[PDB]
Symmetry: C12
């Protein structure tokens, strides 16, 4: 259950360097944004993007120093199990891809998903972040 | 629930819109910031090419500011509690400072629905008149 | 369920400027008055009133500076879910329209409503505030 | 419950009435202020053209002051707890300072009734003799 | 349920001024004595006693200054809902009428009442205080 | 429960009786003061024309002092807990200082009985020998 | 339920003055000893003992000053409702009568009683203290 | 439970016995003092004419001292918890200081039994050899 | 239920003086060791040992001053009701008899016992301590 | 759940790998250190002869660094709560500093499964491409 | 559960053994001291004539030291929780300082079994090779 | 239930001295690592390794001073009962054998096990640690 909404974006190159930078945490799950960061970064690598790097603890101040072409950022709106025994997992994420040249959001997505009650939070998140980030798969 | 939208301008893809401080009148922390992030993306998905999230709007060359407030953003109490969202929006012409467009939307979802889904879906419908 | 009681009032103009000013909160729901403020303001716009503005954090000191013709104020007497699982939402509001020239209450209303237990608080409130504020719809 | 009203003056639409400090003898915060707001509106709806909410009454040129106290204003305990309101009112001639009219009303509502409804409905009936 | 016990008393005049003065609160219901004060005062007016006044926050020091002929005082022994869901309301009151000339209790009453479980505390109290205070109705 | 009264004087309507400090040996606050107020009224209803509520008794010209203590004054625990009262009284000749009359009464009521009723009813029976 | 055990004692006179002095409280019921004091004193009067007096807050220092012939003292070992809803009342008392001349215990008793669950603590106590103190009834 | 008594002296009615400090090894406050009071009375009822409750014994001219300790003195847990008592006693010749008599007794009662009853009954049986 | 394990020991004399000295408390029952001390001492007397004395609050420093021939010591490993309503009592004790001449453990025992759920802790303890200490019965 | 691995180098038994600081993004204390210990052993079992657990890697002559983060490591709530693990890994060439290999794995186990088992089993599968 | 014992010396009745500090790795206070006391007695019952409970061992002329640790010593949770014991022992030659004998034993008992029984019984079996 | 995974290792000698050194505790069971230490040490002795010693409260600084040839270390990842009544015991351990000459891990193992709900934690642990450590049994 849930939906995914994507704007169009550029076809990314295998050699386009991407900085994953502070994914905001708007939930009461500690480190939820950090989990999304890790999950996102590996999604971006699995999608064929050779050089992907997560920022440390504007932000473009940094990404240029790492000679990144783009910055992937976002926020997590929901990341938890619903309350009670057999509460299903629920994830909600937004993502922005930023062109480091001008600071302009060239691609954006929103995805939410409510899981099976016999599913893990990490599983749903991981699946959703992969579907949401699929247009950032490297072009053939 | 419901959605009510007033008349408003026909938006162009090159019209710069700046999303600014969506108030949280709920007990869910960061409800407003979540509403900002979803709104910005809704606008971009609606074809507004340049949307930024924060007077300030002028220095960012924005034509319009999108603002508003969240009135409800939560699961109802108990297990199987259903997600409830309530939001108001206002679209502001930056040159004169006037509300040119405003809207209000509420929604209650199924028991097995995510709150983030309801909110995202609702915010999409409410802001649907700001696409082109 | 519930009732709405309205005094007569003037037929408002599309170009009558209205200031929405501090709606008292007499409930234990934080920001309940602020929610009513936002809801009310958009109701007033949806009703055809072009220039509607909510005051910041007598009060007529301000409304004249904004050249407002009227001030809509009120209070919230109830704004909550009844207690327990499946507690129905309940709203209770009063509203006064003030002529900024003389300070006189020219129109007033009281509305209460108990919702469906499968309804949101925000939904009931929004519906009730719209019915209550309907005589402030702009004249044709 | 019940309502008992004493005799009182025939009120005129131009008689200025000032609602003043309705005591809260309940554990529901702002019960009295809620009773003030509902009363004022009841009076206006009853045709009193000028009703204001706060010696002081003289400086506001009021003929009468409406006052009173709330004795009960709550849901009964437990889920399905029924709303209970109890109120006393007194109408005061400002020139001499005498109670010219007084009334007492209590009411218990259905389980599925709002407290704000009961109170509003009750306060309407109690103050019904102050209309014209 | 409950009983009312009354001594004889004088037949009060419509123009006999009465001061309602500090009704003691012997319960754990806050303001219970104040509620009885308000309820009592209006009962006394409804009973045909023209000038009735409640004292502010012996006491005869005051009542003479207000030229009162009598003082109605008392205490509340019980004023609550019995414990638990559907606990019936229970009221218990005593009342003394004092002649301001000499300080002598010329009339006295005790009333208790246990209510219907679907009844309000305020309703039972109000009814009981009216029955208890009925001999202080003004003579024809 | 029960009531036991010793012999005592035949009281006259003009005999001034002063009720003085009825001890509270319960966990119900003001139990004793409630017992004082009910006692005073019982005495007046019993035809004692002058009863006052506080050595001191002499300065008030009282012939007798009524005193005592409350041993139980509560609802039994749980819902449907029944009201339980237990009281002792002593009547004192003020001139010599001797107990001339004394009595003890206990009572348990129905589940649907008020505590104030039980106490009032019990205190009436116990003090019934002090009427005339 | 329960038992009463009594030693023999003197036949007391109607004019034998008795001081009731500090009945120890060995329970977790506050004022339990004081209740027994009051109950005992009236039992002693009801039993035909004309002058009976309870001491204020050895002890024979006092009783001689009041010209008492005897002192009735004791302790309360149990005075409570058993735990839970419908817990029966339980009383346990010991009593000593002291000759003020020599300080010697001339009469002593122990009584315990478990009540009906629909009985009051005060009722059981009162009944038990009366049975226990019955040999101190005045001789004919 | 059980009772075990050792041999001991034949007590005379004129033998002065002084009850001294019965230790409380329970969580029931004053268990030992309750055991002292019950013991003293048991001894008197058993025909010992002079029994007093507190080296010291010599200055009171006592022949014997009765002492001991309480090991259990409580209701078992839960509603319907049964009362449990456990006590040890020792009888001491004051001249030489030797235990001349000692005894141990435990008892569990019915659910509907008072703790004070069990203890009193048990303490009676245990000390029964000190009567004459 | 439970077992008792005893080493052989000497046949004790009726006139062998025994000091019962600090029985360790290894449970969360306060005074458990003290209870065992009292119980043990009387067991030793009931077993025919004329002079038995419990120490106040090595230890042989004391026992020699009392001219004791032996010291009985030990520890309590368990002394409680099992958890919950109708939790059976459980006792666990070890005992050492010490020759005051040389300090050598000449006799030792371990006993545990789980009681009937309708039994007292004090009863089980008392029974077990008596069985465990039975070889210290005086020889005929 | 699932496992996704990117391409990576063919590892040799003599390639020194150093496991370094696996972040804990869970509320289970030491989740990351547990993940480090299991990973190191998985690598050794996979035939990497020299694996050490902590710039630093250079001074230890390591060719590769294995790192990552734990996103979930817990039993689901309630009794019969099922164990849930979620992990990301990255393999880093020490000379240039580049990720040459990366992987993500999640897993939910039976109710009667140990958490340590799930994690160990999952971490084995995820790192299976780093064996030779 | 189980018991595993290594080989060890044949003990003589005159071999002095000193029990020394048995570690408590449980949340049951004094578990180790309880294990010391039971062990000492087991050894004595096994025919070791001189067993003492505390380098030090030399000054006490002991040949061997018995030591160890408790890993579990508790009732399982809930009512009817079964008692669980787990212990390790080591026997040490004092002259050289070497472990000459070591053993490990665990045991779970019936619901209606005492913890002290399980432990005592288990410790008996584990140490059974140190008898003669 | 559970698994055991072992790398190959050397065939250890009966006279190869082994130091058991700080087994990390990654659980919320206090002393879990210490229990594993004790259990492991005796497993190593039972496996035929004559001289086995546990370290006190790199670490190779110590093992050389004790002339140890190897160090057995590890960590405990899980050591507890699952939550609730009848929660089964669960153990999870890793182990490293270190050559004291060079500091190199020459043998390593991971073992987890979920027990029977009518089993003790100590029993499962003990069994698992013995299976896991079986290749460190001394060669014939």
């Amino acid at each position: 259950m849930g939906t995914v909404r994507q704007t169009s974006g550029p076809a990314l190159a295998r050699g386009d360097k991407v900085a994953v930078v502070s994914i905001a945490n708007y939930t009461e799950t500690p480190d939820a944004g950090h989990s999304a960061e890790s999950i996102a970064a590996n999604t971006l690598r699995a999608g064929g993007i050779a050089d992907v790097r997560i920022a440390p603890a504007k932000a473009l101040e940094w990404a240029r120093s790492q000679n990144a072409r783009y910055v992937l950022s976002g926020a997590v709106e929901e990341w938890r199990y619903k309350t009670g025994v057999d509460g299903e997992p629920v994830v909600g994420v937004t993502f922005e891809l930023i062109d480091v040249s001008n600071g302009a959001v060239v691609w954006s997505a929103t995805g939410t998903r409510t899981g099976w009650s016999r599913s893990g939070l990490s599983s749903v998140a991981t699946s959703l972040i992969a579907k949401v980030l699929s247009p950032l798969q490297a072009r053939q």
